[PDB]
Design a protein around this ligand. Sequence first.
Ligand SMILES: Nc1ncnc2c1ncn2[C@@H]1O[C@H](COP(=O)(O)OP(=O)(O)NP(=O)(O)O)[C@@H](O)[C@H]1O
Ligand SMILES: Nc1ncnc2c1ncn2[C@@H]1O[C@H](COP(=O)(O)OP(=O)(O)NP(=O)(O)O)[C@@H](O)[C@H]1O
Ligand SMILES: [Mg+2]
Ligand SMILES: [Mg+2]
Ligand SMILES: [Mg+2]
Ligand SMILES: [Mg+2]
Lengths: 265, 265
Amino acid sequence: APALTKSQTDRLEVLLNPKDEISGKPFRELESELLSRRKKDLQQIYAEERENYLGKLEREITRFFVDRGFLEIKSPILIPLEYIERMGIDNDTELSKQIFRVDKNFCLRPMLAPNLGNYLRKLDRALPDPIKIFEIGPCYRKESDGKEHLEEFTMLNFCQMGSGCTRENLESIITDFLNHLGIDFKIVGDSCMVFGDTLDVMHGDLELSSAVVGPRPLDREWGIDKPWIGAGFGLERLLKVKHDFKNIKRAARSESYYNGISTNL
Amino acid sequence: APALTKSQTDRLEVLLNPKDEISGKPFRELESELLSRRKKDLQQIYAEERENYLGKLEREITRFFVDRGFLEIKSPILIPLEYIERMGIDNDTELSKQIFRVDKNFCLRPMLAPNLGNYLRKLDRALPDPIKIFEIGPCYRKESDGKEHLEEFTMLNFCQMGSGCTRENLESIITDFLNHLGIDFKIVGDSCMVFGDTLDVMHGDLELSSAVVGPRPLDREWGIDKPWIGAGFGLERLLKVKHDFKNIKRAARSESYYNGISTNL
Ligand SMILES: Nc1ncnc2c1ncn2[C@@H]1O[C@H](COP(=O)(O)OP(=O)(O)NP(=O)(O)O)[C@@H](O)[C@H]1O
Ligand SMILES: Nc1ncnc2c1ncn2[C@@H]1O[C@H](COP(=O)(O)OP(=O)(O)NP(=O)(O)O)[C@@H](O)[C@H]1O
Ligand SMILES: [Mg+2]
Ligand SMILES: [Mg+2]
Ligand SMILES: [Mg+2]
Ligand SMILES: [Mg+2]
C-alpha cells in the first residue's frame, strides 16, 4: 500500500475522466484499468458517432444562429495589423503584447470583431434592417495561464445592427443560447479598455463571454453609425463547462486529447 | 455606344456571376443592373438559407466521411517547425520557401499530413484495423499565382491505415466522394519530391487533389509501419469548380465576396 507519487498521480489524472468511478491498489493496476476504459471510450466513438466535440459544437451553434436569422460568415484568419490599431489597441495595452505577428503587415486574428465590423458596413448596403451575422473560427493570443486559456482557440461572435439592439434582446439571445446548450451562467457588469462597459457572462469564476451594447465611439472608424449589440464566446470554454473538464487542454484542437480522452495510451 | 474601358469591364466582372444573362448599353446602366441583381442574391440568402458556402461544404464533406466510417479530427493549426523537417522538406525544396513561420518554433501548417500521421500512430494503440480518419481545416502557403491559389485555404485530408489500403479502394473513395458532390474529374499519375508517385485528381488543368498509396520510407519517422492510403483536397478549388467561379478569390474566406457575390456594392 505505498502512497502514489505525485508523478504517478499526474499520469492517472491524464487518464481520468470526470464521470469515472474513482484507494489501496498499486499504480500499475490503476493505470491498466484506466487505459482499458479509455480505449473502450475511443472504440465506442469510432463505432458509433465519429464526431469531434469541437466540430460538433460548432455545427450545433451554427444551426442555432442560422435558425434565429443570423447570416453565417467565414472571414480571413490572417488579418492586417492595421485592423488591430483601428480597434484602438495601443501598443501599451495588454492585448498588444498578445498578438501573434506573421509578416510586417499581418497577424493571426486575436478576435473576430474587426472582420464582422467590415461585414456589417458592407452588408448594410444590401440587406434589410436589422442586420444579423455571426462567425465561428480560430483566434490566437499569447497567454501565460494554461488552466482556462489556450494560445489557439475557437471563438463564436454574433452581432446585430439597426433596430432591436437593446440590452434586453442581447441578454435574451444569450439566455436562449446557453439554455439550449445546457450551460449554467450568470450575467455580470465588467469593463475593458477597448469597449467600455461590457456584460460578462460568467460560470462561477470562469468568463464564458464578453458582450457589448453599442454604439461606441470607435464605430465611426469602421464606417458604422447605427445601434448594435454583440457578444463573443470561447467554444473551448463552453466545452470545458459542458463536459466538466478540469483543464481546457481537454477541449482544444490537440494531438494529446480527442473528445477529452488522452490519446497517449 | 462608346466602348467600355478595361477598368469598367473589370468592375462589371467583379459584379458578374457565372449564371448571369450577359452589348450597347452604357457603363452606369450595366453597373446598376448588376448591383441590383447582386443585392437581390444576398437578400435571398439572408431570407432563406443563411449558410456560407465554405462552411456548408465543410459540413457536407464531414457528413460524407463520418457516414463512411472515418473519424473526424480537429488538430492544431500552428504546428512545430520540426514537423516540416520530419516531413523531409529540405530548405532547398520549393515548399520550404512557402512556409509561414510564426515563432522560432512554430509555423502555420501548410498541410494536414503531419498531425494525421501522429493520430494514426496514437490511435493504432486503441482502435481496430482499419484506422480511418479525416480532418478539414485551414492551411497556409505563400504563393505567387492568384487565379487558382490562395495563401489561406481549406484542406480536406482523409486517410486509412491497416487493411484495405489499395489503389483500388482509394480511387473508389475518391470517385464516390466527387460523384456525391457532382464534380467532374479524371485521375492522373504525377510525382512530387516529398511523396514519390502520387495520383493527382484533375479537373481539366486544375489539380483538385494529390493522393498517395503507401507505404513510403519517411513513414518510420512518424512511427507508422503499416500500409496506408490518403488524399488531400482543396475546398476552395472544389467550390470554384462546383460553382464555376472564374477566380478562386470568390470561394475563399474573404471580406470581398460572400458565396461568390461581391460584397462591394
Ligand atoms: N486564450 C483564450 N483561450 C480560450 N478562450 C479564450 C481565450 N481568450 C478569450 N477566450 C474566450 O473568448 C471570449 C471573448 O474574448 P475576450 O472577452 O476578449 O477575452 P478576455 O476578456 O481576455 N477573457 P480572460 O482573458 O479570460 O480574462 C472570452 O470570454 C473567452 O471565453
Ligand atoms: N495555395 C493553394 N490554394 C488553394 N488550394 C490549394 C493550395 N495549395 C494546395 N491546394 C489544394 O490542396 C491540395 C493538396 O495539396 P498539394 O497537392 O500539396 O498542392 P500542390 O500539389 O502544390 N498543387 P499546385 O500548387 O496547384 O500545383 C491540392 O490539390 C489543391 O487542391
Ligand atoms: Mg484575456
Ligand atoms: Mg472579456
Ligand atoms: Mg503548390
Ligand atoms: Mg499536389
